């Protein structure tokens, strides 16, 4: 909340400094100076506000963010891959169950004793 | 260990089937409550010794089979338990050269 | 937490860039200190964009770890099936012995 607002203010100050550097010395150099000082003070205040919390950095999430993609792009692809994997193992298990049922029917046709005990097992 | 190639899998079926292999199946042998020494304490009844040498004893001297053909221990029994062309061939129990 | 440490590191980098811009404007030329300040400002803007992306990643959908755990469980089940097959293999190795 407040940290996002501070980051947005820092981005706006960066844009203003870039515009002042690009335009002309006419733009008050003291104005950009005070802007940079306020930006440093706000960065220190944001560090103080965010100095004891969370702790869960360990992921390629940074590579996906720096890989010209958001969490819905690379994260979406990862979630789709996980969904494909989970759907595939379910198909595996279902086909295994079907083959087992087929062989159970065949072994019941083979021996009544086996049918009688497949029934005790069930 | 991946295997699973259609060719690799197909080799497995032939090799396994070869080692293993209308009933034409051996006659069901009823259990005998008295055995020649411990069960019937019959000890040696000369009759038992005579029967083993020349008479057909269903399990002491041979395997009866169905269709009536009698196969002695030395002989090899060819039988077809599944309803298919392939026939289980049982090799001789004794195999005395 | 981690975002707070990232913001503190970004502030330290901004202070270092300000010191570098001071050194450049001091020993740097008029058309050099301005360029160095513009480069430091671009770096600070990139750091702020990275912080915004980090916030968007900390937010948005919070199920990534859930999907990762589900995939890990599926992989563990597959590994258990493979271990069962290898156990059957060692059992049959003992069967020939």
């Amino acid at each position: 909340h407040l940290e996002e607002h501070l980051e947005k203010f820092v981005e706006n100050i960066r844009q203003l400094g870039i515009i002042v550097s690009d335009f002309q010395p006419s733009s008050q150099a003291g104005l950009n100076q005070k802007l940079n000082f306020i930006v440093t003070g706000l960065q220190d205040i944001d560090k103080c506000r965010q100095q004891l919390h969370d702790i869960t950095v360990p992921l390629e999430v940074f590579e996906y963010i720096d890989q010209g993609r958001n969490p819905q792009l690379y994260t979406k692809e990862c979630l789709e891959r996980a969904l494909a994997k989970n759907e595939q193992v379910k198909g595996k298990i279902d086909t295994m169950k079907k083959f087992k049922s087929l062989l159970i029917q065949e072994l019941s046709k083979v021996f009544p004793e086996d049918m009688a005990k497949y029934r005790s097992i069930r | 260990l991946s295997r699973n190639e259609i060719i690799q899998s197909y080799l497995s079926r032939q090799s396994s089937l070869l080692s293993s292999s209308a009933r034409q199946l051996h006659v069901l042998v009823p259990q005998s409550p008295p055995t020649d020494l411990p069960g019937l304490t019959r000890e040696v009844t000369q009759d038992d010794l005579d029967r083993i040498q020349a008479s057909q004893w269903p399990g002491v001297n041979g395997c009866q089979d169905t269709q009536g053909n009698w196969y002695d221990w030395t002989q090899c029994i060819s039988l077809d338990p599944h309803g298919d062309d392939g026939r289980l061939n049982i090799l001789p129990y004794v195999c005395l050269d | 937490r981690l975002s707070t440490l990232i913001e503190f590191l970004l502030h330290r980098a901004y202070s270092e860039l300000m010191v570098l811009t001071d050194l450049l404007p001091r020993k740097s030329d008029v058309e050099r200190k301005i360029e160095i300040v513009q480069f430091a400002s671009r770096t600070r803007q990139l750091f702020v964009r990275l912080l915004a992306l980090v916030k968007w990643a900390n937010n948005a959908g919070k199920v990534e770890k859930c999907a990762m755990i589900s995939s890990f469980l599926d992989q563990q089940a597959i590994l258990f099936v493979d271990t069962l097959d290898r156990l059957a293999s060692l059992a049959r190795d003992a069967l020939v012995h």
Binding site: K92, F99 | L91 | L84, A88, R92
Partner: peptide
């Protein structure tokens, strides 16, 4: 005969192991 019986028992397992392996694969 008895060696054939032992090999047949071992193979009965071979088709179980192999079946499950194929399934997991």
């Amino acid at each position: 005969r008895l060696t054939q019986l032992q090999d047949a028992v071992n193979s009965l397992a071979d088709q179980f192991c192999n079946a499950i392996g194929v399934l997991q694969q």
